[PDB]
Amino acid sequence: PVALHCGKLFDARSGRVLGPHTVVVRDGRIDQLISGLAAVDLRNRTCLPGWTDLHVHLGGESSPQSYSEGFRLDPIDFAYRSVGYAERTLLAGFTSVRDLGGEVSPHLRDAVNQGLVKGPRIFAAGKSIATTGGHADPTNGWNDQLSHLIGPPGPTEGVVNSVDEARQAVRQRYKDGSDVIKITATGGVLSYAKSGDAPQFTVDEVKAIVDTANDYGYKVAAHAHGTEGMKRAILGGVTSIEHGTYMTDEVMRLMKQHGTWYVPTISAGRFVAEKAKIDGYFPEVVRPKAARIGAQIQDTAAKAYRNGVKIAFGTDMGVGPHGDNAREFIYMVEAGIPAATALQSATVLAAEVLGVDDQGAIETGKRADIIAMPGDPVADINAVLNVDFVMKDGEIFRQ
């Protein structure tokens, strides 16, 4: 039981900054919202709900050695790194995240929920589902000896080639304890493969995945760069698109007609664009794709906002360093999206994307996830980089 006294409160639903308020928290939820017992003095701060990042990979981080550590390290070492990754992410103001790939995050989520380590609320996808040779095929780039020893991946490993295999793959993700489904509709940048925008899913496989996920209560997020794969994913019925690098007008019309969410992840594009200039950082099969794709992301986000496409907050953390998730707000504002809309995309629109109704705004009966900063983020978006108060589930982690 703690009473919070803060000078300004940001109303996520309305998008306006109000005046002084008092928030009473008992049992981990918001109970009273008096406008105009333990006490915390935040009268020189602005009150905001906790932020949600809809695209992170807490199981790793990009490095010059990232393409050779896989054959030498074990997932235990990656878990030991993920401890610090999760702590840094939580302390930056992000009280919940959506993990879209990696088999260490279901375990990190369990550890955080049991209180063993500090972190945000994790919605984990587990293994991503791809086709043979696809962006998420786990044996791309292996030699003949290793490939023969491991064998060809199947639905248990996340590689599908037909409707029945897609059904079995979704059921295996359910068996492994996932909260959300992730597929790679097209090729990517960071994979050890040749193509980066070619369509790698048929519409019948996407429809089968979506139907199976709807039976089990899941939502589907699709990774896409090319136009044809993006259109196939949209027509199959996916919930959100994770990249839209080559979005055309016909794709935007389909997204508006279907109600598909768009997650730009500008930070990853900028990071790969700058890292491609360095010599030797990326493998020679990866470098051209990065240098070509990373530069066509911010203009796409501006065009999508101008055309009326619904936009949600995501950074593709992992490619970039964990703990710097709030610079995406600055990128969004410099891409033409207003500061209030950019803030809303990470609180209430993110809750709509996740499919939950117990978070996203400071309202009675909702989870007590509250952050504070000395400045006013609407007037100056640069204030999002100075967060000094963090509260998750009624427990204070930073003051």
Q: Is 322 annotated as a binding residue?
A: no
182 is known to lie in a ligand binding site: yes
Segment interacting with Zn ion (CB under 5 A) among 89-97, 168-176, 315-323, 387-395: 315-323
Q: Check binding of 98 to Zn ion (CB under 5 A).
A: no
- Nearest Cα residue to 373 out of 9, 109, 71: 9
- 287: tokens are 């470098």
57 is in an annotated binding site: yes
Shortest Cβ 53–a second copy spacing (Å) = 22
Residue 258 annotated as binding site: no
Total chain residues near Zn ion (CB under 5 A): 2
Q: Which of 60, 59, 70, 279 is nearest to 192 (CA)?
A: 70
Question: Under the criterion CB under 5 A, does residue 53 sit at the interface with Zn ion?
Answer: no
The nearer residue to a second copy, 183 or 326, going by C-beta atoms, is 183
Looking at the Cβ atoms of 79 and 342, the one nearer to a second copy is 79
Closer by beta carbon to Zn ion, 271 or else 305? 271
Least distance to a second copy, CB of residue 284, Å: 11
d(CA 387, CA 96): 16
Pick between residue 79 and residue 373 the one whose CB is nearest to a second copy: 79
Given Zn ion, a second copy, none, residue 223, with its beta carbon under 5 to 8 Å by kind, binds: Zn ion
Whose Cβ is closer to a second copy: residue 38's or residue 149's? 149
Member of 61, 316, 328, 369 binding Zn ion (CB under 5 A): 316
- Which listed range, 65-73, 102-110, 224-232, 309-317, lies at the site for Zn ion (CB under 5 A)? 309-317
Residue 82's φ and ψ, nearest 5 degrees, are -65, -25
Q: Residues interacting with a second copy, by CB under 8 A?
A: 70-77, 79-81, 83-84, 104, 107-108, 110-111, 116-117, 131-134, 137, 140-146, 149-150, 152, 154-156, 161-162, 164-165, 167-168, 171-172, 174-175, 177, 192-195, 198-200, 202, 215-217
Q: Based on CB atoms, which residue is closest to a second copy, 137 or 242? A: 137
Residue 223 is labelled as binding a ligand: yes
Whole-number Å distance between alpha carbons of 345 and 311 = 7
What is the 3-state secondary structure of the chain? CEEEEEEEEEECCCCEECCCEEEEEECCEEEEEEECCEEEEEEEEEEEECEEEEEECCCCCCCCCCCCHHHCCCHHHHHHHHHHHHHHHHHCCEEEEEECCCCCHHHHHHHHHCCCCCCCEEEECCCCEECCCCCCCCCCCCCHHHHHHHCCCCHHHCECCCHHHHHHHHHHHHHCCCCCEEEECECCCCCCCCCCCCECCCHHHHHHHHHHHHHCCCCEEEECCCHHHHHHHHHHCCCEECCCCCCCHHHHHHHHHHCCEECCCHHHHHHHHHHCCCCCCCCCCCHHHHHHHCCCCHHHHHHHHHHCCCECCCCCECCECCCCCCHHHHHHHHCCCCHHHHHHCCCHHHHHHHCCCCCCCCCCCCECCEEEECCCCCCCHHHHHCCCEEEECCEEEEC
| Closest CB to a second copy among residues 172, 315 | 172
Given a second copy, Zn ion, none, residue 142, with its beta carbon under 5 to 8 Å by kind, binds a second copy
The CB-of-144 to a second copy minimum distance in angstroms stands at 6
Output the smallest distance, CB 48 to Zn ion, in A: 26
Shortest Cβ 356–a second copy spacing (Å): 17
Nearest CB to a second copy, comparing residues 195 and 307: 195
Stretch that binds Zn ion, among 221-229, 298-306, 324-332, 339-347 (CB under 5 A): 221-229
Question: Does 223 participate in binding Zn ion (rule CB under 5 A)?
Answer: yes
Backbone discontinuities in the chain, residue before each (C to N > 2.5 A): 36
What residues make contact with Zn ion under the rule CB under 5 A?
Answer: 223, 316
Binding residues for Zn(2+), as ranges, are 55, 57, 182, 223, 243, 316
Binding residues, as ranges, are 55, 57, 182, 223, 243, 316
